[PDB]
Ligand binder design. Sequence first.
Ligand SMILES: CC(C)C[C@@H](C(=O)N[C@H](C(=O)O)c1ccccc1)[C@H](O)C(=O)NO
Ligand SMILES: [Zn+2]
Ligand SMILES: [Zn+2]
Ligand SMILES: [Zn+2]
Ligand SMILES: [Zn+2]
Ligand SMILES: [Zn+2]
Ligand SMILES: [Zn+2]
Lengths: 509, 510, 517
Amino acid sequence: SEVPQVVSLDPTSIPIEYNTPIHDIKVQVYDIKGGCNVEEGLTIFLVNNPKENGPVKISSKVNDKQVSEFLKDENMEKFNVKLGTSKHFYMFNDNKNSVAVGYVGCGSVADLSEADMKRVVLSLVTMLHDNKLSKLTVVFEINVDKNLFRFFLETLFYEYMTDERFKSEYIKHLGVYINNADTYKEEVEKARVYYFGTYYASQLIAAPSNYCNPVSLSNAAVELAQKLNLEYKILGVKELEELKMGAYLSVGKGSMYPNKFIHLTYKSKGDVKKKIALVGKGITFDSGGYNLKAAPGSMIDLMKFDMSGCAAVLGCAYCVGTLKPENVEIHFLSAVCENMVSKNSYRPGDIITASNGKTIEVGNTDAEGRLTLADALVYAEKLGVDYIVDIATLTGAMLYSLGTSYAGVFGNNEELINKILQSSKTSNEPVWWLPIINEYRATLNSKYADINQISSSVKASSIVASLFLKEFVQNTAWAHIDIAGVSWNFKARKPKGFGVRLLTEFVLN
Amino acid sequence: SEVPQVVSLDPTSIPIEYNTPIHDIKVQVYDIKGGCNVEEGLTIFLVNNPGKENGPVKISSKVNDKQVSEFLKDENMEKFNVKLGTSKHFYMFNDNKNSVAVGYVGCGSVADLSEADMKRVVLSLVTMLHDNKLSKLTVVFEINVDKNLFRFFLETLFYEYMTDERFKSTEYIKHLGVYINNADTYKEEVEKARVYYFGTYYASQLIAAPSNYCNPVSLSNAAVELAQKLNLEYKILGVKELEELKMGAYLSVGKGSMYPNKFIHLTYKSKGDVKKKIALVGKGITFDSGGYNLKAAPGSMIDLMKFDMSGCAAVLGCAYCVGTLKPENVEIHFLSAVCENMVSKNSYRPGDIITASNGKTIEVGNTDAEGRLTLADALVYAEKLGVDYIVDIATLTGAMLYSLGTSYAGVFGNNEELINKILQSSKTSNEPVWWLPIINEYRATLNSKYADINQISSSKASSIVASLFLKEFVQNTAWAHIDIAGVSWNFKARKPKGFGVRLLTEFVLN
Amino acid sequence: SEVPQVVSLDPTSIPIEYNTPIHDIKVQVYDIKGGCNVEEGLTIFLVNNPGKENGPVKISSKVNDKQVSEFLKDENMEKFNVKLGTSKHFYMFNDNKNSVAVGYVGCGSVADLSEADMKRVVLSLVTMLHDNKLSKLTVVFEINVDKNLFRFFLETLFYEYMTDERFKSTDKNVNMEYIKHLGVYINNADTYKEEVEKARVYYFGTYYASQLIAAPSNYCNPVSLSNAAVELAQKLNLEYKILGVKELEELKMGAYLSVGKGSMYPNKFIHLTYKSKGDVKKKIALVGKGITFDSGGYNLKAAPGSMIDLMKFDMSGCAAVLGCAYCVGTLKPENVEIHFLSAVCENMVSKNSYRPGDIITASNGKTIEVGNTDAEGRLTLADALVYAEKLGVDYIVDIATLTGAMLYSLGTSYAGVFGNNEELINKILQSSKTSNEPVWWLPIINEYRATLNSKYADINQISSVKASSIVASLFLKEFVQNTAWAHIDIAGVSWNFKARKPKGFGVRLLTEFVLND
Ligand SMILES: CC(C)C[C@@H](C(=O)N[C@H](C(=O)O)c1ccccc1)[C@H](O)C(=O)NO
Ligand SMILES: [Zn+2]
Ligand SMILES: [Zn+2]
Ligand SMILES: [Zn+2]
Ligand SMILES: [Zn+2]
Ligand SMILES: [Zn+2]
Ligand SMILES: [Zn+2]
């Protein structure tokens, strides 16, 4: 619980913003039928043109003569609907009050993807960050379903919010005009919850490794559990030794921060008809160990993000703990540690023993995630659960295979895999199914240990890692989500909080 | 048609073996319900034991010989186990008092065998064939296989048994017996397998041929020769017709070569009425040096890059199978933009803007991404034919080794139905393929400042970005792209797989 | 003159846009003391707030419209701040009940705008011009600018506003609509009026240079580049001469000829000349590196970071020289004779290429040991400098994308200048100040000269002292015997990586140099 320090100026906790300006925003949703009022603030129309880079056309009654003249076809024709393009103007309305009116181009395709919507939102966020507004009103002259509408709000809330914890005028009202308004009203408060779960997770990821270490991360986890009335249990070195979790403990041998195993539990006050375990990779810093990240491209300044899985899980815990779904018992697990170089570090070639008795030959100390997850997976299966889903920034190959938008899912069960893809669809956190190819299993056959940590090959590293993990689930439906490529937003230089909404939709639906 | 030379010792054709020792093998299939006869040669029993770890081998099959039956009694066989890949050889005398040889191959613990360890089963069998000067091989199936897997057994047996000695200078069986239950249903698979094998081995021959032998002219010559031995309409476009067709992307790639570009266009048409028109496109880079983006990086594998025409080989390999089996109600076009990517005073340069045959201007960012340039023009041509399906197959991106590896190929496309047909074809051909996404969000990375489009991204999903490129040259036709860069070469055996041939033939047949 | 081809689809000339939409813009400058008329298009105020960091916006120019004046009152305007780069659009009706567009661009709180600051200001202006279909732009200067800062505003505005579509076919922009009129309100307008057409000229010289650079190497080759230059000389009535290979052979330019040996394109030496109608008090030779593509040769650019796709850029010096030729040929300065020189070739990999280790002989007799074929620029420049000095000139200034080390030394904004004469260098610095193309003076360190001592040849091409920009300047110095000479290394500043396009760097610098003596 007490965070060790090297000098007195070393941080002993992660700063967390719980009450964000987003929570102060009153959201009202109206149906476009009946006309739009353009009293105060900034009003943005979401317009497309099914053709490409075509002219903007507003087709919604505006209960204001002055702003209608502005929105006349001849004047709006100036402007085009290219995805992400926007223009906003300041003017006097009938009350000659100063109002701002504009649009965001939504391309030429009727059905907007999650990527398209983000681009729509970022442009919207760009106008909000340069204006001293009181109210933002968005008019939907495009087609979006209930899930995409919620995705819109979530993304708006998340991108609008700015993290100033390590640094030394937000809108107070949000208006929305849409067709089946009464059907969309319920998605508003769900978005507000999903946003913070993601933003909460983001905060942990963005937290530098001197702030976010195994001790402070587990401490932060306990505090969240306490605020939500979740049962919690933190395993220390002595208990981990008694549980024989040698793989997980080996990775952390070289750290000044003691290993901390995070175990939260949500249990429903009804009948329990589904037990789910969520496992997140919690490497507070990945130096690579003795296989130090020194090669051109390793991105070592990166590696505080190696606990993104843990963040997604804790972020998920917030959402579930807030929404309190029925008929479920959920375990939020993370084997948290730090992978460092020391006199005490574990070595390449070392043979270590996991909690299920299997000996593992370490071939690369930078492949630390599968070791911590292995012992985490054994712990999970002993709980007697229906599904085990782990989420991890495991392999960089994901950047070459799937890139920065879609995460990969691996598994031993097609039904479980299918539930994750559906959750990807309704949460709009894109996931693609990748195969666990049994032919590669032999490359993990060690000469001295029961199994290799790695293949001698760089061929199919994400798949080989899934084969490894597969060895630590005996008789349980299990899935593995590799978020190494999608976790960090390189363009915006911040986390995405990837996985929080995905996992929440999985538990709820 | 005439291959240019630098010295008089430069080869002017690819040596091709059409009649292989496999074709000389008389194959007979009998039903197990009648007993197995021995007498001659080597007889191998394929045995498993479902539900035991490495259980004892037990023969299940009446042997029409009293004392090879006594030899095969369980007390004698309990010794031995069915561990996958395990094999033993037996010497004994039959009823007549003559010397016979018998043995077995273990098929593991799983009732339903692999696609991969059927390969190991076959590989184990071939071990028995290489160190032996046998005249007859007999295989008894005491495992259960469906119609597709049996054909696959023969194909793999044929392919692995065969040895390529075309480039060497300074004992094959003549009969194959198969004992299997519902033999009468399986007999139809025998000649289909032999056809599928050679189409694959034919592709293998073209792929294995070094680049001084296999160049744009000689490969195109070989394609013409194939069209003639089959009876397909054929036409080869040289530099002059290609200029008239304005195929600037394809022509740029070959500018630095001593070998003129040759576009291969074979056609199979059924005498029936035609309900499906299909264009099959293969990447045909006879050698990929990388150009001015020279392969000087450590993982470049500059020595194996004769393999960069695997797509073309798969397409031509398919052409053999289709041309022999003569399917109904279908019209097939075999297309390949064949050229060589070299470094020269005449070679295309990084930064260059070139114009494709559909009018789109392209900024070349990397000369080693040459395949998509040739395929783009090949794809424009394909759509001009007015077909229902366009499928290209290519060793396009090295990233496939990192994504799917050396066993599974990746398939991309603009049409889910076509993707599923490729997928089904993967199951029945047993050439494993996995569906990968075309992520439209990465399309913006191909937006060039001066040309219509970039050839490459700056940025890493190179396989996905390359597919995004290709999609731009198919406007309104169902199209799929198979990236076999990772699976084309069998690194362990130091030989090609001829991957894609059987997949494409099963694709057109269904 | 005839460009050789590999296939018939190979381009045989560089496409050049001469009549640009910028030239079609009628520009008027009015005095602010008379008030601003707003009544079409978009009207933009360049605003400041001296001493208030992100301070409030306040318009201070009489607006000859009651409705627009009321809109622009301080009470309405304070909601906005003057943050440098900030911009806003306003919609309103004027007294004649017509809809007009008005806005502002923040010019910060610092009285004196830098060259970097002014560009940022302009960039924000062009954004308002893009994606909007305006017919008129009116710009109001509520800041203080001298004439060459004012001129810099128009040049940069013109340059950034213009979009190059020579190589688009199926993706030309559907919405490219240029304004037809440009209005400017400024104090003491009669003093600034002279800068307008000077800006237009400075703009095109720069854009012409940008066009040559942006043109890919299959379009822009040694032959096609010399041809456009000749066509350029003809349109300006300049004396011109292009040297082919065996004229170069019998001027014995072995270094220059070596670089092009591996190319399918013959070497072409550009020699354009401007002579004043009057008596000549200054003779100047301008020498530009003209490598239409730098592959590196047998020292191939294969290392991570070599940026081989960008190397069609290697003739930026040459382009800067021709862009200057345009400006000089148009403005017709007095008492001056200018030689515009460029030894053009392409550095390629071939059986005919020159090799590392080769000893070659320059036109002044000095033998050179080649240590790196990617150090080709100094070889072509060596012979060009000898040619230049034989012209009997007073100042020789060469401009070249010579060393990537400039990225490590000065970065992407400032070019480096080397020289053998302080008077010339300062003139370069003075022209840099008035052209607003930033240049910094770097030393030629003689102690490093010994690293060029070859065992067999008279001199080494390169060092074995990783201070490469200085070593290269030491090399170049060896081919100038008794003439004031300066060397401007633009390897770091020529290409705009963010905007993914050329800068046309050097044109305004070189022209201001010629104009001010
Ligand atoms: C340049 C294209 C990407 C193709 C190229 C290739 O993949 N080169 C690279 C390499 O071998 O290091 C590489 C591999 C994986 C990921 C990125 C880059 C392959 O040689 C080819 O010629 N394909 O047509
Ligand atoms: Zn690691
Ligand atoms: Zn890690
Ligand atoms: Zn290549
Ligand atoms: Zn290739
Ligand atoms: Zn060079
Ligand atoms: Zn150069």
